[PDB]
Protein backbone atom coordinates (compact mmCIF):
# COMPACT_ATOMS: atom_id res chain seq x y z
CA UNK A 1 0.00 0.00 0.00
CA UNK A 2 1.17 3.60 -0.50
CA UNK A 3 2.71 5.43 2.44
CA UNK A 4 0.64 7.21 5.12
CA UNK A 5 -0.12 10.94 4.65
CA UNK A 6 2.51 13.08 6.38
CA UNK A 7 1.71 16.10 8.54
CA UNK A 8 3.94 19.17 7.99
CA UNK A 9 5.62 20.18 11.24
CA UNK A 10 4.82 23.57 12.73
CA UNK A 11 7.76 25.86 12.05
CA UNK A 12 9.01 29.05 10.45
CA UNK A 13 7.57 29.50 6.93
CA UNK A 14 9.09 32.89 6.14
CA UNK A 15 12.44 32.94 4.35
CA UNK A 16 14.57 35.53 2.50
CA UNK A 17 17.03 35.73 -0.47
CA UNK A 18 18.43 39.04 0.82
CA UNK A 19 18.85 38.53 4.56
CA UNK A 20 18.61 41.42 7.03
CA UNK A 21 20.60 41.28 10.27
CA UNK A 22 18.26 42.54 12.99
CA UNK A 23 21.13 43.48 15.35
CA UNK A 24 23.44 45.42 13.02
CA UNK A 25 23.84 49.19 12.59
CA UNK A 26 26.60 49.14 9.95
CA UNK A 27 25.38 48.77 6.36
CA UNK A 28 28.02 46.08 5.58
CA UNK A 29 26.52 43.87 8.29
CA UNK A 30 22.82 44.88 7.87
CA UNK A 31 22.15 43.22 4.51
CA UNK A 32 23.42 39.92 3.07
CA UNK A 33 22.57 39.13 -0.55
CA UNK A 34 22.51 35.38 -1.22
CA UNK A 35 21.96 33.64 -4.54
CA UNK A 36 19.08 31.71 -2.93
CA UNK A 37 17.08 31.53 0.30
CA UNK A 38 17.89 28.66 2.70
CA UNK A 39 14.56 26.93 3.40
CA UNK A 40 13.77 24.19 5.92
CA UNK A 41 10.70 21.95 6.38
CA UNK A 42 10.02 19.10 8.81
CA UNK A 43 7.26 16.49 8.94
CA UNK A 44 5.75 13.75 11.07
CA UNK A 45 3.81 10.66 10.13
CA UNK A 46 1.11 9.89 12.68
CA UNK A 47 -0.41 6.94 10.79
CA UNK A 48 1.27 4.24 8.73
CA UNK A 49 4.21 3.18 6.63
CA UNK A 50 6.71 6.02 6.20
CA UNK A 51 7.50 5.14 2.55
CA UNK A 52 11.05 4.87 1.18
CA UNK A 53 11.58 8.33 -0.35
CA UNK A 54 10.42 11.68 1.04
CA UNK A 55 10.14 14.75 -1.20
CA UNK A 56 9.42 18.45 -0.69
CA UNK A 57 7.29 19.96 -3.46
CA UNK A 58 6.70 23.64 -4.26
CA UNK A 59 3.59 24.09 -6.46
CA UNK A 60 3.95 20.40 -7.38
CA UNK A 61 7.63 20.56 -8.30
CA UNK A 62 10.36 18.77 -6.37
CA UNK A 63 12.77 21.01 -4.45
CA UNK A 64 14.31 18.23 -2.33
CA UNK A 65 14.27 14.44 -2.06
CA UNK A 66 15.94 11.88 0.23
CA UNK A 67 15.47 8.45 1.81
CA UNK A 68 12.48 8.23 4.22
CA UNK A 69 14.07 6.67 7.32
CA UNK A 70 11.59 7.13 10.19
CA UNK A 71 8.39 8.76 11.35
CA UNK A 72 9.87 12.29 11.37
CA UNK A 73 12.24 14.03 8.96
CA UNK A 74 13.79 17.39 8.08
CA UNK A 75 14.83 18.81 4.70
CA UNK A 76 17.06 21.82 4.03
CA UNK A 77 17.21 23.21 0.48
CA UNK A 78 17.61 26.41 -1.52
CA UNK A 79 14.93 28.49 -3.29
CA UNK A 80 16.25 31.05 -5.77
CA UNK A 81 13.08 32.97 -6.78
CA UNK A 82 10.96 35.23 -4.57
CA UNK A 83 7.19 34.73 -4.12
CA UNK A 84 4.65 32.60 -2.21
CA UNK A 85 4.64 28.81 -2.75
CA UNK A 86 2.23 26.00 -1.87
CA UNK A 87 4.61 23.52 -0.21
CA UNK A 88 3.87 19.84 0.29
CA UNK A 89 5.77 16.87 1.72
CA UNK A 90 5.12 13.61 -0.17
CA UNK A 91 6.12 10.14 1.00
CA UNK A 92 6.53 7.64 -1.84
CA UNK A 93 7.13 3.91 -2.21
CA UNK A 94 6.68 1.49 -5.09
CA UNK A 95 2.87 1.43 -4.60
CA UNK A 96 2.38 5.21 -4.74
CA UNK A 97 3.01 8.71 -3.39
CA UNK A 98 0.88 10.33 -0.68
CA UNK A 99 1.17 14.12 -0.31
CA UNK A 100 0.48 16.27 2.74
CA UNK A 101 -1.97 19.15 2.70
CA UNK A 102 -0.23 22.28 1.37
CA UNK A 103 1.37 24.87 3.66
CA UNK A 104 2.22 28.30 2.16
CA UNK A 105 5.84 29.40 2.42
CA UNK A 106 7.02 32.93 1.78
CA UNK A 107 10.36 33.56 0.00
CA UNK A 108 11.22 37.24 0.23
CA UNK A 109 13.25 39.22 -2.31
CA UNK A 110 13.84 42.96 -2.80
CA UNK A 111 11.67 43.22 -5.88
CA UNK A 112 8.71 42.83 -3.49
CA UNK A 113 7.62 39.52 -5.07
CA UNK A 114 6.59 38.22 -1.64
CA UNK A 115 4.38 41.21 -0.79
CA UNK A 116 0.73 42.09 -1.42
CA UNK A 117 0.35 45.25 -3.50
CA UNK A 118 0.22 48.48 -1.51
CA UNK A 119 -2.76 50.11 -3.22
CA UNK A 120 -4.05 52.75 -0.82
CA UNK A 121 -6.82 55.29 -1.22
CA UNK A 122 -6.05 58.87 -2.28
CA UNK A 123 -5.97 61.23 0.69
CA UNK A 124 -6.64 64.95 1.27
CA UNK A 125 -7.48 66.73 -2.03
CA UNK A 126 -5.76 64.29 -4.40
CA UNK A 127 -7.98 63.22 -7.33
CA UNK A 128 -7.27 60.28 -9.66
CA UNK A 129 -5.42 60.80 -12.95
CA UNK A 130 -4.39 58.42 -15.70
CA UNK A 131 -0.77 58.66 -16.82
CA UNK A 132 -1.59 58.95 -20.53
CA UNK A 133 0.00 62.22 -21.65
CA UNK A 134 3.43 60.67 -22.22
CA UNK A 135 4.90 63.40 -19.99
CA UNK A 136 6.94 63.02 -16.80
CA UNK A 137 5.04 63.67 -13.57
CA UNK A 138 7.59 63.32 -10.75
CA UNK A 139 8.03 63.99 -7.06
CA UNK A 140 10.66 63.45 -4.36
CA UNK A 141 9.88 61.51 -1.14
CA UNK A 142 12.22 62.18 1.80
CA UNK A 143 13.58 59.42 4.04
CA UNK A 144 13.28 61.55 7.19
CA UNK A 145 9.67 62.58 6.50
CA UNK A 146 8.33 59.55 8.43
CA UNK A 147 9.06 61.10 11.86
CA UNK A 148 7.70 64.61 12.62
CA UNK A 149 6.12 65.15 9.20
CA UNK A 150 4.50 61.69 9.62
CA UNK A 151 4.42 61.17 5.85
CA UNK A 152 4.92 57.50 4.93
CA UNK A 153 4.94 55.66 1.56
CA UNK A 154 1.29 54.58 1.97
CA UNK A 155 0.35 58.30 1.84
CA UNK A 156 2.01 58.92 -1.57
CA UNK A 157 -0.63 59.48 -4.31
CA UNK A 158 1.32 57.03 -6.45
CA UNK A 159 -1.17 56.50 -9.27
CA UNK A 160 -0.69 60.23 -10.10
CA UNK A 161 3.07 59.93 -10.77
CA UNK A 162 5.35 58.47 -13.41
CA UNK A 163 8.47 58.94 -11.28
CA UNK A 164 8.99 58.69 -7.51
CA UNK A 165 12.46 59.76 -6.35
CA UNK A 166 13.85 58.82 -2.91
CA UNK A 167 15.94 61.55 -1.20
CA UNK A 168 18.57 60.75 -0.24
CA UNK A 169 21.17 57.94 -0.50
CA UNK A 170 24.48 59.12 1.05
CA UNK A 171 28.07 58.47 -0.07
CA UNK A 172 30.36 57.18 2.75
CA UNK A 173 33.15 59.39 4.08
CA UNK A 174 34.14 61.19 7.27
CA UNK A 175 36.19 64.31 7.88
CA UNK A 176 36.75 66.41 4.77
CA UNK A 177 34.37 64.23 2.71
CA UNK A 178 30.94 64.90 4.29
CA UNK A 179 31.61 68.02 6.38
CA UNK A 180 28.32 69.60 5.18
CA UNK A 181 26.44 66.97 7.26
CA UNK A 182 27.88 68.39 10.50
CA UNK A 183 25.33 71.24 10.25
CA UNK A 184 22.48 68.76 10.87
CA UNK A 185 22.52 67.58 14.51
CA UNK A 186 23.70 63.94 14.85
CA UNK A 187 23.64 63.47 11.05
CA UNK A 188 27.39 63.18 10.33
CA UNK A 189 27.79 60.71 13.19
CA UNK A 190 24.83 58.70 11.87
CA UNK A 191 26.53 58.28 8.51
CA UNK A 192 29.82 57.22 10.15
CA UNK A 193 27.99 54.47 12.05
CA UNK A 194 26.22 53.24 8.90
CA UNK A 195 29.56 53.26 7.01
CA UNK A 196 31.65 51.52 9.71
CA UNK A 197 34.12 49.19 8.00
CA UNK A 198 32.96 50.46 4.56
CA UNK A 199 35.23 52.31 2.13
CA UNK A 200 34.68 56.00 1.56
CA UNK A 201 33.10 56.87 -1.80
CA UNK A 202 30.76 53.84 -1.66
CA UNK A 203 26.99 54.47 -1.21
CA UNK A 204 25.19 53.39 1.97
CA UNK A 205 21.83 54.12 3.69
CA UNK A 206 21.73 57.22 5.94
CA UNK A 207 18.95 56.12 8.35
CA UNK A 208 18.66 52.33 8.24
CA UNK A 209 15.89 52.44 10.83
CA UNK A 210 13.60 54.62 8.67
CA UNK A 211 14.66 52.90 5.44
CA UNK A 212 14.31 49.26 6.50
CA UNK A 213 13.20 48.59 10.09
CA UNK A 214 10.43 51.00 11.27
CA UNK A 215 7.06 49.19 11.25
CA UNK A 216 4.77 50.60 8.49
CA UNK A 217 1.43 49.70 6.90
CA UNK A 218 1.72 46.34 5.18
CA UNK A 219 5.13 45.51 6.73
CA UNK A 220 4.42 45.25 10.45
CA UNK A 221 5.04 41.59 11.33
CA UNK A 222 8.28 40.93 13.27
CA UNK A 223 9.62 38.51 10.69
CA UNK A 224 8.78 40.62 7.61
CA UNK A 225 12.37 40.96 6.38
CA UNK A 226 11.98 44.38 4.72
CA UNK A 227 10.02 47.08 6.58
CA UNK A 228 10.39 50.89 6.65
CA UNK A 229 10.41 52.94 3.45
CA UNK A 230 12.10 50.25 1.33
CA UNK A 231 9.60 47.50 2.35
CA UNK A 232 6.67 49.80 1.50
CA UNK A 233 8.29 50.88 -1.82
CA UNK A 234 8.64 47.21 -2.80
CA UNK A 235 4.92 46.69 -2.15
CA UNK A 236 4.18 49.93 -4.05
CA UNK A 237 6.06 48.50 -7.08
CA UNK A 238 3.78 45.44 -6.86
CA UNK A 239 0.76 47.78 -7.05
CA UNK A 240 2.34 50.03 -9.75
CA UNK A 241 4.66 48.01 -11.98
CA UNK A 242 5.26 50.91 -14.33
CA UNK A 243 6.03 53.55 -11.70
CA UNK A 244 9.77 54.38 -11.90
CA UNK A 245 11.26 54.46 -8.39
CA UNK A 246 14.72 56.11 -8.40
CA UNK A 247 17.21 56.43 -5.55
CA UNK A 248 18.57 60.01 -5.45
CA UNK A 249 22.21 60.39 -4.38
CA UNK A 250 23.25 63.76 -2.93
CA UNK A 251 21.02 66.74 -2.16
CA UNK A 252 22.09 69.88 -0.28
CA UNK A 253 23.94 68.17 2.60
CA UNK A 254 25.21 64.96 0.99
CA UNK A 255 26.86 66.38 -2.15
CA UNK A 256 30.44 66.95 -0.82
CA UNK A 257 31.85 63.59 -2.01
CA UNK A 258 31.07 64.39 -5.69
CA UNK A 259 33.77 67.13 -5.60
CA UNK A 260 36.49 64.42 -5.16
CA UNK A 261 35.38 62.30 -8.16
CA UNK A 262 37.93 63.82 -10.56
CA UNK A 263 40.08 61.02 -9.07
CA UNK A 264 38.95 58.09 -11.24
CA UNK A 265 39.97 55.64 -8.48
CA UNK A 266 37.20 57.20 -6.31
CA UNK A 267 34.72 57.63 -9.21
CA UNK A 268 35.06 53.99 -10.24
CA UNK A 269 34.56 52.79 -6.65
CA UNK A 270 31.38 54.96 -6.48
CA UNK A 271 29.97 53.67 -9.77
CA UNK A 272 30.65 50.04 -8.71
CA UNK A 273 28.87 50.67 -5.40
CA UNK A 274 25.79 52.01 -7.27
CA UNK A 275 25.77 48.85 -9.35
CA UNK A 276 25.89 46.74 -6.20
CA UNK A 277 23.13 48.85 -4.57
CA UNK A 278 20.80 48.26 -7.53
CA UNK A 279 21.62 44.52 -7.53
CA UNK A 280 20.79 44.48 -3.82
CA UNK A 281 17.60 46.59 -3.91
CA UNK A 282 15.77 45.38 -7.00
CA UNK A 283 12.70 47.60 -6.62
CA UNK A 284 14.76 50.66 -7.72
CA UNK A 285 14.79 51.47 -11.46
CA UNK A 286 18.01 53.49 -12.02
CA UNK A 287 19.73 56.38 -10.26
CA UNK A 288 19.22 60.11 -9.84
CA UNK A 289 22.33 62.24 -9.25
CA UNK A 290 21.61 65.36 -7.20
CA UNK A 291 25.05 66.97 -7.14
CA UNK A 292 24.53 70.46 -5.81
CA UNK A 293 26.52 71.83 -7.48
CA UNK A 294 29.41 71.31 -10.00
CA UNK A 295 31.58 74.43 -9.51
CA UNK A 296 30.57 74.82 -5.87
CA UNK A 297 28.23 77.37 -4.28
CA UNK A 298 26.39 74.50 -2.54
CA UNK A 299 26.46 73.89 1.23
CA UNK A 300 30.29 73.77 1.54
CA UNK A 301 32.08 77.06 0.90
CA UNK A 302 35.47 75.31 0.54
CA UNK A 303 34.50 72.98 -2.32
CA UNK A 304 34.14 73.51 -6.01
CA UNK A 305 36.59 73.43 -8.89
CA UNK A 306 36.82 74.29 -12.58
CA UNK A 307 37.25 70.53 -13.17
CA UNK A 308 33.76 69.75 -11.93
CA UNK A 309 32.06 70.01 -15.33
CA UNK A 310 34.32 67.40 -16.89
CA UNK A 311 33.89 65.12 -13.83
CA UNK A 312 30.04 65.38 -14.14
CA UNK A 313 30.13 64.41 -17.83
CA UNK A 314 32.50 61.50 -17.13
CA UNK A 315 30.38 60.32 -14.19
CA UNK A 316 27.18 60.29 -16.26
CA UNK A 317 28.87 58.43 -19.10
CA UNK A 318 30.23 55.77 -16.72
CA UNK A 319 26.90 55.53 -14.83
CA UNK A 320 25.13 55.00 -18.16
CA UNK A 321 27.64 52.31 -19.18
CA UNK A 322 27.08 50.49 -15.87
CA UNK A 323 23.29 50.78 -16.14
CA UNK A 324 23.36 49.60 -19.77
CA UNK A 325 25.25 46.50 -18.63
CA UNK A 326 22.84 45.92 -15.71
CA UNK A 327 19.92 46.42 -18.14
CA UNK A 328 21.09 43.60 -20.46
CA UNK A 329 21.89 41.33 -17.52
CA UNK A 330 18.32 41.69 -16.25
CA UNK A 331 16.13 42.50 -19.29
CA UNK A 332 15.00 45.70 -17.50
CA UNK A 333 15.20 49.31 -18.57
CA UNK A 334 17.19 51.44 -16.15
CA UNK A 335 17.04 55.21 -16.02
CA UNK A 336 19.70 57.81 -15.36
CA UNK A 337 18.59 61.20 -14.17
CA UNK A 338 19.94 64.30 -12.49
CA UNK A 339 18.55 67.21 -10.47
CA UNK A 340 20.39 70.38 -11.53
CA UNK A 341 20.46 74.09 -10.62
CA UNK A 342 18.23 76.24 -12.83
CA UNK A 343 20.46 79.33 -12.40
CA UNK A 344 22.34 80.16 -15.61
CA UNK A 345 25.58 80.81 -13.71
CA UNK A 346 25.51 77.19 -12.55
CA UNK A 347 24.14 75.62 -15.80
CA UNK A 348 27.01 76.86 -17.91
CA UNK A 349 29.60 75.17 -15.68
CA UNK A 350 28.42 71.89 -17.26
CA UNK A 351 28.22 70.77 -20.87
CA UNK A 352 24.68 69.35 -20.69
CA UNK A 353 24.55 69.14 -24.48
CA UNK A 354 27.12 66.32 -24.12
CA UNK A 355 25.87 64.85 -20.83
CA UNK A 356 22.28 64.58 -22.16
CA UNK A 357 23.29 61.64 -24.36
CA UNK A 358 23.82 59.59 -21.17
CA UNK A 359 20.66 60.77 -19.39
CA UNK A 360 16.95 59.94 -19.58
CA UNK A 361 15.71 63.08 -17.81
CA UNK A 362 17.06 66.35 -16.45
CA UNK A 363 15.14 67.55 -13.37
CA UNK A 364 15.52 71.32 -13.63
CA UNK A 365 15.24 72.74 -10.13
CA UNK A 366 13.28 75.87 -11.13
CA UNK A 367 12.63 76.89 -7.53
CA UNK A 368 14.59 78.52 -4.65
CA UNK A 369 15.26 81.51 -6.91
CA UNK A 370 14.75 83.78 -3.92
CA UNK A 371 14.17 83.24 -0.18
CA UNK A 372 15.25 84.03 3.41
CA UNK A 373 18.90 83.33 2.58
CA UNK A 374 18.87 86.86 1.07
CA UNK A 375 17.04 89.55 3.07
CA UNK A 376 17.74 92.39 0.64
CA UNK A 377 16.88 91.23 -2.90
CA UNK A 378 13.33 89.78 -2.79
CA UNK A 379 11.48 88.04 -5.62
CA UNK A 380 9.30 85.11 -6.70
CA UNK A 381 11.05 81.85 -5.77
CA UNK A 382 9.61 79.59 -8.53
CA UNK A 383 8.09 81.89 -11.16
CA UNK A 384 7.86 81.09 -14.85
CA UNK A 385 8.77 84.62 -15.94
CA UNK A 386 10.14 87.91 -14.60
CA UNK A 387 7.66 90.24 -12.89
CA UNK A 388 6.59 93.60 -14.34
CA UNK A 389 8.62 95.60 -11.80
CA UNK A 390 11.90 93.84 -12.75
CA UNK A 391 11.90 92.40 -16.27
CA UNK A 392 15.66 91.79 -16.11
CA UNK A 393 15.31 89.31 -13.22
CA UNK A 394 18.00 86.63 -13.71
CA UNK A 395 16.47 83.67 -11.90
CA UNK A 396 13.29 82.52 -13.62
CA UNK A 397 12.13 79.13 -14.98
CA UNK A 398 12.20 80.31 -18.61
CA UNK A 399 15.82 81.55 -18.25
CA UNK A 400 16.95 78.16 -16.89
CA UNK A 401 15.22 76.30 -19.75
CA UNK A 402 16.64 78.78 -22.25
CA UNK A 403 20.18 78.34 -20.90
CA UNK A 404 19.89 74.57 -21.48
CA UNK A 405 18.34 75.00 -24.93
CA UNK A 406 21.13 77.43 -25.92
CA UNK A 407 23.76 74.78 -25.07
CA UNK A 408 21.98 72.36 -27.45
CA UNK A 409 19.97 70.30 -24.96
CA UNK A 410 16.95 68.66 -26.57
CA UNK A 411 13.71 70.08 -25.15
CA UNK A 412 12.19 66.64 -24.40
CA UNK A 413 14.97 65.93 -21.85
CA UNK A 414 14.03 68.89 -19.68
CA UNK A 415 11.59 68.36 -16.78
CA UNK A 416 10.35 71.55 -15.17
CA UNK A 417 10.27 71.98 -11.38
CA UNK A 418 7.28 72.97 -9.23
CA UNK A 419 7.48 73.79 -5.52
CA UNK A 420 5.12 72.24 -2.97
CA UNK A 421 6.38 74.76 -0.39
CA UNK A 422 6.76 78.50 -0.10
CA UNK A 423 9.78 80.51 0.99
CA UNK A 424 9.33 83.76 2.86
CA UNK A 425 10.44 86.62 5.04
CA UNK A 426 9.13 88.59 8.03
CA UNK A 427 9.29 92.33 8.64
CA UNK A 428 9.13 93.31 4.96
CA UNK A 429 9.27 97.10 4.74
CA UNK A 430 10.19 100.04 2.53
CA UNK A 431 8.39 98.80 -0.61
CA UNK A 432 6.81 100.90 -3.37
CA UNK A 433 3.47 100.84 -5.16
CA UNK A 434 2.05 98.02 -3.02
CA UNK A 435 4.58 95.46 -4.29
CA UNK A 436 6.16 93.95 -1.17
CA UNK A 437 9.00 92.44 -3.29
CA UNK A 438 10.45 95.93 -3.84
CA UNK A 439 11.23 96.28 -0.09
CA UNK A 440 13.74 94.49 2.16
CA UNK A 441 13.12 92.06 5.08
CA UNK A 442 14.27 91.63 8.69
CA UNK A 443 14.47 87.80 8.81
CA UNK A 444 12.77 84.58 7.74
CA UNK A 445 9.08 83.76 7.96
CA UNK A 446 8.01 81.27 10.61
CA UNK A 447 8.21 77.88 8.96
CA UNK A 448 6.29 74.64 9.35
CA UNK A 449 9.49 72.64 10.08
CA UNK A 450 12.30 75.12 9.44
CA UNK A 451 12.71 78.90 9.39
CA UNK A 452 11.95 80.56 6.06
CA UNK A 453 10.08 77.62 4.51
CA UNK A 454 6.34 76.72 4.68
CA UNK A 455 4.56 73.58 3.40
CA UNK A 456 1.98 74.38 0.73
CA UNK A 457 -0.59 72.52 2.85
CA UNK A 458 -0.10 75.17 5.58
CA UNK A 459 -0.15 78.09 3.11
CA UNK A 460 -3.54 76.87 1.88
CA UNK A 461 -4.79 75.90 5.34
CA UNK A 462 -3.69 78.93 7.37
CA UNK A 463 -2.39 81.77 5.20
CA UNK A 464 -5.29 82.28 2.80
CA UNK A 465 -7.58 83.80 5.42
CA UNK A 466 -7.72 86.63 7.95
CA UNK A 467 -5.37 89.54 7.31
CA UNK A 468 -3.40 87.83 4.54
CA UNK A 469 -3.56 89.41 1.09
CA UNK A 470 -3.47 86.94 -1.84
CA UNK A 471 -2.19 88.12 -5.25
CA UNK A 472 -1.70 86.23 -8.51
CA UNK A 473 1.03 87.91 -10.55
CA UNK A 474 0.00 87.04 -14.08
CA UNK A 475 3.15 88.46 -15.69
CA UNK A 476 5.50 86.25 -13.64
CA UNK A 477 2.87 83.49 -13.27
CA UNK A 478 3.29 83.36 -9.51
CA UNK A 479 1.13 83.69 -6.39
CA UNK A 480 2.12 85.36 -3.13
CA UNK A 481 0.48 86.13 0.23
CA UNK A 482 1.37 89.16 2.32
CA UNK A 483 0.46 90.12 5.88
CA UNK A 484 0.87 93.89 6.08
CA UNK A 485 0.92 94.28 9.88
CA UNK A 486 3.93 92.03 10.46
CA UNK A 487 5.36 92.25 6.93
CA UNK A 488 5.24 88.46 6.46
CA UNK A 489 5.65 87.64 2.74
CA UNK A 490 5.47 84.11 1.23
CA UNK A 491 6.23 83.11 -2.37
CA UNK A 492 5.03 79.69 -3.57
CA UNK A 493 3.42 77.74 -6.43
CA UNK A 494 -0.38 77.26 -6.60
CA UNK A 495 -2.75 75.42 -8.93
CA UNK A 496 -2.72 78.33 -11.42
CA UNK A 497 1.06 78.83 -11.58
CA UNK A 498 1.50 75.07 -11.97
CA UNK A 499 -1.04 75.16 -14.81
CA UNK A 500 1.04 77.89 -16.49
CA UNK A 501 4.18 75.67 -16.17
CA UNK A 502 2.32 72.68 -17.61
CA UNK A 503 0.98 74.61 -20.62
CA UNK A 504 4.52 75.97 -21.15
CA UNK A 505 5.89 72.43 -21.09
CA UNK A 506 3.35 71.33 -23.72
CA UNK A 507 3.91 74.49 -25.78
CA UNK A 508 7.72 74.10 -25.81
CA UNK A 509 7.70 70.28 -26.09
CA UNK A 510 9.57 69.80 -22.81
CA UNK A 511 9.61 66.51 -20.94
CA UNK A 512 7.13 67.08 -18.10
CA UNK A 513 6.97 68.39 -14.50
CA UNK A 514 8.48 67.28 -11.17
CA UNK A 515 8.06 68.58 -7.61
CA UNK A 516 9.82 68.91 -4.24
CA UNK A 517 8.63 67.49 -1.85
CA UNK A 518 5.57 65.18 -1.92
CA UNK A 519 4.77 65.33 1.81
CA UNK A 520 4.06 69.11 1.73
CA UNK A 521 1.21 69.06 -0.86
CA UNK A 522 -2.46 68.77 0.07
CA UNK A 523 -3.25 67.50 -3.44
CA UNK A 524 -3.80 70.82 -5.25
CA UNK A 525 -0.27 70.96 -6.70
CA UNK A 526 -0.02 67.39 -7.99
CA UNK A 527 -3.62 67.59 -9.28
CA UNK A 528 -2.63 70.64 -11.35
CA UNK A 529 0.61 69.02 -12.55
CA UNK A 530 -1.44 66.13 -13.95
CA UNK A 531 -4.28 68.20 -15.42
CA UNK A 532 -2.03 70.85 -17.00
CA UNK A 533 0.03 68.22 -18.86
CA UNK A 534 -3.13 66.68 -20.33
CA UNK A 535 -3.56 63.52 -18.21
CA UNK A 536 -7.18 62.32 -18.19
CA UNK A 537 -9.17 62.22 -14.95
CA UNK A 538 -9.82 58.66 -13.75
CA UNK A 539 -8.13 55.27 -13.30
CA UNK A 540 -6.79 52.58 -15.61
Ligand SMILES: CC(=O)N[C@@H]1[C@@H](O)[C@H](O[C@@H]2O[C@H](CO)[C@@H](O[C@@H]3O[C@H](CO)[C@@H](O[C@@H]4O[C@H](CO)[C@@H](O[C@@H]5O[C@H](CO)[C@@H](O[C@@H]6O[C@H](CO)[C@@H](O[C@@H]7O[C@H](CO)[C@@H](O[C@@H]8O[C@H](CO)[C@@H](O)[C@H](O)[C@H]8NC(C)=O)[C@H](O)[C@H]7NC(C)=O)[C@H](O)[C@H]6NC(C)=O)[C@H](O)[C@H]5NC(C)=O)[C@H](O)[C@H]4NC(C)=O)[C@H](O)[C@H]3NC(C)=O)[C@H](O)[C@H]2NC(C)=O)[C@@H](CO)O[C@H]1O
Pocket residue numbers: 140144145146147148149168184187190207209214250251252253254290291292297298339340341342343365367368369370373395421449450453516517
Ligand atom coordinates in the same frame (compact mmCIF):
# COMPACT_ATOMS: atom_id res chain seq x y z
C1 LIG B 1 18.59 79.08 -8.42
C2 LIG B 1 19.66 79.66 -7.55
O1 LIG B 1 20.78 79.73 -7.83
N1 LIG B 1 19.29 79.99 -6.28
C3 LIG B 1 20.15 79.54 -5.14
C4 LIG B 1 19.42 78.48 -4.38
O2 LIG B 1 19.42 77.35 -5.26
C5 LIG B 1 20.19 78.12 -3.09
O3 LIG B 1 19.39 77.29 -2.25
C6 LIG B 1 19.52 75.90 -2.47
O4 LIG B 1 18.75 75.56 -3.64
C7 LIG B 1 18.75 74.18 -4.00
C8 LIG B 1 17.97 74.11 -5.30
O5 LIG B 1 18.54 74.96 -6.26
C9 LIG B 1 18.14 73.29 -2.90
O6 LIG B 1 18.34 71.92 -3.09
C10 LIG B 1 17.42 71.08 -3.66
O7 LIG B 1 16.08 71.48 -3.37
C11 LIG B 1 15.41 71.05 -2.22
C12 LIG B 1 14.58 72.21 -1.70
O8 LIG B 1 15.19 73.44 -1.85
C13 LIG B 1 16.45 70.61 -1.15
O9 LIG B 1 15.69 70.32 0.02
C14 LIG B 1 16.43 70.42 1.23
O10 LIG B 1 17.00 69.11 1.43
C15 LIG B 1 17.81 69.09 2.59
C16 LIG B 1 18.64 67.82 2.60
O11 LIG B 1 19.59 67.83 1.60
C17 LIG B 1 16.79 69.08 3.74
O12 LIG B 1 17.52 68.81 4.94
C18 LIG B 1 16.79 68.02 5.86
O13 LIG B 1 16.26 68.96 6.83
C19 LIG B 1 15.46 68.36 7.81
C20 LIG B 1 14.94 69.45 8.74
O14 LIG B 1 13.63 69.82 8.44
C21 LIG B 1 16.29 67.32 8.60
O15 LIG B 1 15.29 66.65 9.34
C22 LIG B 1 15.64 65.95 10.48
O16 LIG B 1 16.08 64.63 10.06
C23 LIG B 1 16.56 63.87 11.15
C24 LIG B 1 17.19 62.63 10.58
O17 LIG B 1 18.56 62.68 10.40
C25 LIG B 1 15.33 63.56 12.03
O18 LIG B 1 15.72 62.83 13.20
C26 LIG B 1 14.73 61.95 13.68
O19 LIG B 1 13.91 62.71 14.59
C27 LIG B 1 12.94 61.95 15.26
C28 LIG B 1 12.38 62.81 16.39
O20 LIG B 1 11.11 63.29 16.10
C29 LIG B 1 13.47 60.65 15.90
O21 LIG B 1 12.30 59.84 15.92
C30 LIG B 1 11.81 59.54 17.23
O22 LIG B 1 12.39 58.26 17.55
C31 LIG B 1 11.85 57.09 16.99
C32 LIG B 1 12.95 56.23 16.41
O23 LIG B 1 14.23 56.41 16.89
C33 LIG B 1 10.84 57.49 15.89
O24 LIG B 1 10.38 56.27 15.32
C34 LIG B 1 9.70 58.32 16.50
O25 LIG B 1 8.74 58.68 15.49
C35 LIG B 1 10.30 59.58 17.11
N2 LIG B 1 9.50 60.00 18.28
C36 LIG B 1 9.80 61.00 19.14
C37 LIG B 1 8.86 62.13 19.37
O26 LIG B 1 10.82 60.91 19.67
C38 LIG B 1 14.55 59.90 15.07
O27 LIG B 1 15.25 58.98 15.92
C39 LIG B 1 15.47 60.98 14.62
N3 LIG B 1 16.79 60.78 14.06
C40 LIG B 1 17.53 59.79 13.60
C41 LIG B 1 17.46 59.53 12.13
O28 LIG B 1 18.15 59.21 14.36
C42 LIG B 1 14.59 64.86 12.46
O29 LIG B 1 13.35 64.50 13.08
C43 LIG B 1 14.30 65.64 11.21
N4 LIG B 1 13.58 66.89 11.49
C44 LIG B 1 12.49 67.29 10.78
C45 LIG B 1 11.93 68.59 11.21
O30 LIG B 1 12.04 66.67 9.93
C46 LIG B 1 16.98 66.34 7.64
O31 LIG B 1 17.86 65.49 8.39
C47 LIG B 1 17.74 67.04 6.53
N5 LIG B 1 18.20 65.98 5.60
C48 LIG B 1 19.48 65.79 5.22
C49 LIG B 1 19.74 64.53 4.47
O32 LIG B 1 20.30 66.55 5.46
C50 LIG B 1 16.01 70.42 3.72
O33 LIG B 1 14.99 70.27 4.70
C51 LIG B 1 15.40 70.62 2.35
N6 LIG B 1 14.75 71.96 2.24
C52 LIG B 1 13.46 72.10 1.82
C53 LIG B 1 13.12 73.44 1.27
O34 LIG B 1 12.68 71.26 1.89
C54 LIG B 1 17.21 69.40 -1.72
O35 LIG B 1 18.38 69.15 -0.95
C55 LIG B 1 17.62 69.65 -3.15
N7 LIG B 1 16.89 68.68 -3.99
C56 LIG B 1 17.39 67.97 -5.03
C57 LIG B 1 16.36 67.23 -5.79
O36 LIG B 1 18.50 67.95 -5.29
C58 LIG B 1 18.91 73.66 -1.59
O37 LIG B 1 18.36 72.96 -0.49
C59 LIG B 1 18.87 75.14 -1.33
N8 LIG B 1 19.59 75.34 -0.04
C60 LIG B 1 19.23 76.32 0.81
C61 LIG B 1 20.30 76.99 1.60
O38 LIG B 1 18.12 76.59 0.90
C62 LIG B 1 20.56 79.41 -2.32
C63 LIG B 1 21.44 79.11 -1.12
O39 LIG B 1 22.75 78.86 -1.47
O40 LIG B 1 21.32 80.22 -3.18
C64 LIG B 1 20.58 80.73 -4.30
O41 LIG B 1 21.50 81.47 -5.08
